[PDB]
Amino acid sequence: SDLTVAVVLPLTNTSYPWSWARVGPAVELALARVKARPDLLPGWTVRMVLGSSENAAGVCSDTAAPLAAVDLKWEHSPAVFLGPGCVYSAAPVGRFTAHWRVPLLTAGAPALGIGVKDEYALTTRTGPSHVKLGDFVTALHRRLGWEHQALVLYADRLGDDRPCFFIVEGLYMRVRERLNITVNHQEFVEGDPDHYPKLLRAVRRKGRVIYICSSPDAFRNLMLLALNAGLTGEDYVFFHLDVFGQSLKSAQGLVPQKPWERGDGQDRSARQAFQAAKIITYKEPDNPEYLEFLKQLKLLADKKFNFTVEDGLKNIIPASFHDGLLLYVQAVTETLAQGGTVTDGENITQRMWNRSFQGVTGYLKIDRNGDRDTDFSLWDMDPETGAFRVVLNYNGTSQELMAVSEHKLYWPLGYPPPDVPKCGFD
Amino acid sequence: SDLTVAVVLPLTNTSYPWSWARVGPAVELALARVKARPDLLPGWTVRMVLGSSENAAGVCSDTAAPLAAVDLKWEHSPAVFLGPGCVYSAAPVGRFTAHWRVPLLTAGAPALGIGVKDEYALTTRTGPSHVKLGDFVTALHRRLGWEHQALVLYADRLGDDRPCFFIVEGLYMRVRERLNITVNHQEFVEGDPDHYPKLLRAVRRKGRVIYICSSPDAFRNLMLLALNAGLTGEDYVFFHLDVFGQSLKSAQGLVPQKPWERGDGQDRSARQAFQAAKIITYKEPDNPEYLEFLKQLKLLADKKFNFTVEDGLKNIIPASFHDGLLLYVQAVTETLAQGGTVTDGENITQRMWNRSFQGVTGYLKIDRNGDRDTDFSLWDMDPETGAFRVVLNYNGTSQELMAVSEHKLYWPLGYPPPDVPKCGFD
Amino acid sequence: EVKYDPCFGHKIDRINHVSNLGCPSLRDP
Ligand SMILES: *[C@@H]1O[C@H](CO)[C@@H](O[C@@H]2O[C@H](CO)[C@@H](O[C@H]3O[C@H](CO)[C@@H](O)[C@H](O[C@H]4O[C@H](CO)[C@@H](O)[C@H](O)[C@@H]4O)[C@@H]3O)[C@H](O)[C@H]2NC(C)=O)[C@H](O)[C@H]1NC(C)=O
Ligand SMILES: *[C@@H]1O[C@H](CO)[C@@H](O[C@@H]2O[C@H](CO)[C@@H](O[C@H]3O[C@H](CO)[C@@H](O)[C@H](O[C@H]4O[C@H](CO)[C@@H](O)[C@H](O)[C@@H]4O)[C@@H]3O)[C@H](O)[C@H]2NC(C)=O)[C@H](O)[C@H]1NC(C)=O
Ligand SMILES: *[C@@H]1O[C@H](CO)[C@@H](O[C@@H]2O[C@H](CO)[C@@H](O[C@H]3O[C@H](CO)[C@@H](O)[C@H](O)[C@@H]3O)[C@H](O)[C@H]2NC(C)=O)[C@H](O)[C@H]1NC(C)=O
Ligand SMILES: *[C@@H]1O[C@H](CO)[C@@H](O[C@@H]2O[C@H](CO)[C@@H](O[C@H]3O[C@H](CO)[C@@H](O)[C@H](O)[C@@H]3O)[C@H](O)[C@H]2NC(C)=O)[C@H](O)[C@H]1NC(C)=O
Ligand SMILES: [Cl-]
Ligand SMILES: [Cl-]
Which residues are glycosylated (chains A, B)? Predict the structure, then answer.
C-alpha cells in the first residue's frame, strides 16, 4: 500500500549537481505528479527515507555512502535506491544494491565501470554516461575526417571524485572500441607550473586533434600559451571537455557567451587563441516542459529547501532524477499491472531498459544496458564578435550530428586541419 | 569480562594465505596461549565471531567483506577486527573500522594505500607490506652500485586481487621516495603471446636491472627467451619478485631448489638462462619457536579444520596473525592495567605501534606507521649444481643486507653489471 | 567496454589509484 524510496545523496553539501537541495525539490515535484496521475501507482503512498553520502568534512565519500545505504536497508527495507551521484560513493553502494537485488536509480555515477551491469545489477542510469561522450567524439571524427591520431590531456589529482579521469576514461575506452585510432593521454596537475612545459611540448609532439578536460582557467591558460607558442587553428583544434559548461554562463540569459573574457589584460590575446578552441558540453533540453520544470524547481528549492537554484547545465541532473523517478513508477505500475510486485527488481528494471520515455528533459532513451542516451552540443565562436554559440548538436539515440541555427563550424583555414601534420610530428 | 574478536576472512576458500583453514588454527593456538598466561587478560574469555570476506563464487570480495563487517559490528559489537587479507576486501572494511574507531588487525592487505593510516586509522599490519619491498630494493641498489635505471615488468589483469600490481606499486613508490632513480614499469598479460615481443624489446631498451613480478612459468619463459635472444648475466640481471616463493619448494625438505627444472626438454637451456636470474622472497623465520608453531598449526588444522597445511613461505601469514593477536592482547592488558578499557582503540593501537615483540616468527617490529618491518631473502644459483640458495638476507628493522652461510652473489662476470650499458640503450 | 587496458577499467576503489602506476602522468603524493 506504500512504497519506500531510500535516498543516498549529499544531504547537506549544496555544491554537487546531485545535491539534495537541488534533487530534493525535483523529487518532490515528481512525487506530486504521481499523486495527480491516477494511471501511476493508484492509492500508494510513496515514502522517502534519506541518508547522506557525505563524510564529516562534507564531501561525498566511499565510506559514508555505503554505510548510509546499509542503514536504510535494515531500518526501512526500501524498494529502490535513489543516488548516489558521486562515482566513489555510487560504486560501493551500487555493489550493495546489486547484492540485495534492490533497483538503484541515479542521474550521476557516469563512470565506465558502473557501465558493467553484470556487476552493477539493477542499476539504471537516467543521466549522462562518460562512454556516451566517446560516442559523440566518435561521430565527430567520422563526420570530419580524423581517423588517425588524437591527444587527450586531463587534470587529475586525488581528493575529489577525479571527474576528469572518469570523463577521459569513458571517452578513451569507447573511442578505441569504435574507431581504434591512436589516442594519447596525459594527466597533469592544474596548480603545478612544472606541467605546462610538458603539456605544450606534448600538444605539438602528440596530436593536432586535442581534447582537454580541465577547469576553464586551465584551458584558457593552455590556449594563451599555445598562441604564444605559435599554435593556431590552421593546424590545431582544441576541444574543451566542459560537460557542465563551467566555462559558459546560463543559456537562459547572459547574451552572449565569452569564455575567453576574464578582465585580466589578456582578453584580446585570449580571444585570438580561442579561435582554435571549441567547447564540448551536454545539450540543454530545448522542449518547453524543461523550462516549466526549472521555474517550479527554483520555487520549491527556495521555499522548502532554502536553496537558490541558478541556471546552468547542472540542472539536467535534478531534471533527470525527476524523469528517472517517474520512469520507475511507470515500470512499477506496469509490473503491478501484470501480477508483479514492487520488489520484482528484475522485472521492473527490464521494463525501464531499452525503452523511450517523455520527461521534463524531453525525449529520453534508456539503452539496452540501462543507461540514458546522452545528447551533446558543440560550441564555436564566429570570427565576428568572438562569441561562442552552439553550431552542432548530437542526438545520442540516433547518433546523428545536425547543424544548429544554420551555423557553421568555424575553421581558420576554411576546413578542419588534419589529425596528422604534413610530415610526421617530428 | 569477555572480549569479542570479529573475523572477516575467507571462511570456506582454502586457497589464500589468510584462509580460515590456515588462520583459524593459528588463532586458536594463540587464544590457548592467552589462557595459559596469567599475565595476559586474566579471567577474560575472548570470543571469536566469524564473517566471510568471500562472495558467491568463493573469492574474496570488495562487497561480501564490508557487508560481513557491518553484520558483525551490529550483532556482536566487537572490540577488534581480524582480517581481511585481500586488498580489495580490506580497503572497504578498513575504512569502516576506522569510522567505527574499532582497531583492525591483519597480516594481509599489504597495499600501498592501506599504509595511509590517516585514512586507515587503527589498522595495524603485522604481516608484510609492499613498501617494505621498496626498502629492500633500495638497500640492494645502494649496496651494489645501481643508482640510475631499473625496469619493472609485472603480470596484471582484472579479476583477482592484482597482487603483482600492488607489489609493484609499493616497490615503485618507496624506491622513488628513497632513491629517485629512473624506474620504468610495463604491465603484461601472462597468457597473451602478443606481449612477449613487446616485453623482450623493453628488456633491452629500458633497463639492465630488471624486476619481474609474475608467475614462475612466465618468469621462466622470459628467461628462456632472453637467453634465446642473447641476454646474459654479463650485462643483465633478472630479479623474480616471488614473495611467497611460488617458484621454490619448502625450506624444510626438498633439497635442493631448482626453479628452472620443469621436465619439459628445456631444463638444460633454462638453467643457462637462470644463471642471470635471482629470486627475491620473504625470509623464512629462522627461530626455533617458528618450527614448533608449524608442527602445532599442522596438527590443529588437520584435526579441527580438515585442512592439510603444507610447508612454504605462505605460513608466515597465519604465523603473523598469531603473533599480531598476542601483541594486541598484551596491549589490551597494558591498557586495562592503566585504567583503560578494551574499547580504547587509540591507546591500544599506540601501545602496539613503534614496538618490538617476540613471537613464533621471532623478532618482529611494528614501525611508527603501524606496519610490521619485513625481512627479505635473496636467492641465487651457484654455477656448480645450478641450485638456488639464499645468499643474502635483509633485516627490515635495521635495513641491513648480510651475507648468508658465507655465500656470494653469483655473477657471470665476477661483479654486478651496470644498470646502464657501455653506450646508451640505443 | 570489457576491453583490457593498463590504466582504464580497473575497478572503482581509491586503492587502485594511489600511485597511478600504469597511467601516464606527471604527479605523485
Ligand atoms: C533524437 O533521435 C531519436 C531517434 O529516433 C528521436 O526519436 C524519435 O522520436 C519520435 C517522436 O519525437 C518517435 O516517434 C513516433 O513514436 C511513437 C512510437 O513509435 C509513434 O506511435 C508516434 O506516432 C504518433 O504520433 C504522430 C505525431 O507525432 C502521428 O502523426 C502518428 O500518426 C502516430 O499517431 C510517433 O510518430 C520515434 O519513434 C523516435 N525514434 C526512435 C528510434 O525512438 C528523438 O526524438 C530525437 N530527439 C530530439 C530531441 O530531437
Ligand atoms: C633485525 O635487526 C634488528 C635491529 O636491531 C634487531 O634488533 C635487536 O634485537 C636484540 C635482541 O634480539 C635487542 O636486544 C636487547 O633488547 C632489549 C631491549 O633493549 C635488552 O633489554 C636486551 O638485554 C637483555 O638481555 C641480554 C641478552 O640478550 C643481556 O645480555 C642484557 O644484559 C639484558 O639483560 C637485549 O640485549 C635489540 O634491542 C634489537 N634492536 C632494536 C633496534 O630493536 C633484530 O633482532 C634483528 N633480527 C634478526 C632476526 O636478526
Ligand atoms: C562541499 O563539497 C565541496 C566539493 O565536493 C567541498 O570542496 C572541497 O573541500 C575539500 C575539503 O573537504 C578540499 O580538499 C582537500 O582534501 C584534503 C583533506 O584534508 C586536504 O588535505 C587537501 O589539501 C585538499 O585541499 C577540496 O580541494 C575542495 N574542492 C573544491 C572544488 O571546493 C566543500 O568543502 C564542501 N563543503 C561543505 C560545507 O561540506
Ligand atoms: C578460491 O579462490 C581462488 C582464488 O581466489 C579461486 O580461483 C580462481 O577462480 C576464479 C573464478 O571464481 C577464476 O576467474 C575468472 O573470473 C570470471 C568470472 O566470471 C571469468 O569470466 C574469467 O574468465 C576468469 O577466468 C580465476 O581465474 C581463478 N584463479 C586461480 C588462480 O585459481 C577459486 O576458484 C576459489 N575456489 C572456490 C571453491 O571458491
Ligand atoms: Cl553522492
Ligand atoms: Cl580476505
Answer: 13, 180, 306, 347, 354, 395
